Amino acid sequence: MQAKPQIPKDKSKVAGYIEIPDADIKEPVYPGPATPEQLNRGVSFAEENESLDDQNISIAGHTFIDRPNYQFTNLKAAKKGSMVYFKVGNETRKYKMTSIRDVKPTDVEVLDEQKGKDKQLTLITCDDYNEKTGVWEKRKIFVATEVK
Numbered sequence: 065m066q067a068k069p070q071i072p073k074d075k076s077k078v079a080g081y082i083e084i085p086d087a088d089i090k091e092p093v094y095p096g097p098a099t100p101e102q103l104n105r106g107v108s109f110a111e112e113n114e115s116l117d118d119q120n121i122s123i124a125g126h127t128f129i130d131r132p133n134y135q136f137t138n139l140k141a142a143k144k145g146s147m148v149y150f151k152v153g154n155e156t157r158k159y160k161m162t163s164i165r166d167v168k169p170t171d172v173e174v175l176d177e178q179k180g181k182d183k184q185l186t187l188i189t190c191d192d193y194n195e196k197t198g199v200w201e202k203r204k205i206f207v208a209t210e211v212k
């Protein structure tokens with residue numbers, strides 16, 4: 065958290081906090097390149113090429129079985145108007161879950177030039193583990209666009 069929300073090289077501190085009252089979520093979002101250790105402690109961005117000042121902010125949801133009460137556990141209770149409060153740097157970024165669907169690792173047409181939006185918070189919540197190869201089949205994607 066600092067002036068003009070951006071992502072530093074330190075992958076240990078918090079860039080912003082994710083607050084979704086509808087999902088009982090008020091947890092720290094870790095700014096990272098979706099590297100293993102980043103997800104093991106919390107949620108991370110999809111890449112490090114994105115930014116908090118960028119139009120594309122994509123948070124990879126690290127769903128886990130061991131833990132019953134972590135960040136994206138109850139995010140499945142969210143809906144179109146869950147009021148997503150991203151407390152980043154200083155400001156409270158409110159997003160609305162207007163575009164909700166789920167995709168698969170074999171769907172490379174969703175993570176693309178989906179321009180035309182404002183600051184969109186792409187919640188990539190990977191659910192359903194495929195033990196046969198080690199992937200997550202259901203990539204639930206909640207595109208919460210910065211709401212008025």
Ligand SMILES: *[C@H](c1ccsc1)c1oc(CO)cc(=O)c1O
Nearest residue numbers: 098110124125126169188190200
């Ligand atoms: C799903 C996943 C999340 C934690 S481990 C696997 C997943 O996540 C991303 C990053 O947003 C992209 C994918 O293609 C995934 O399979």
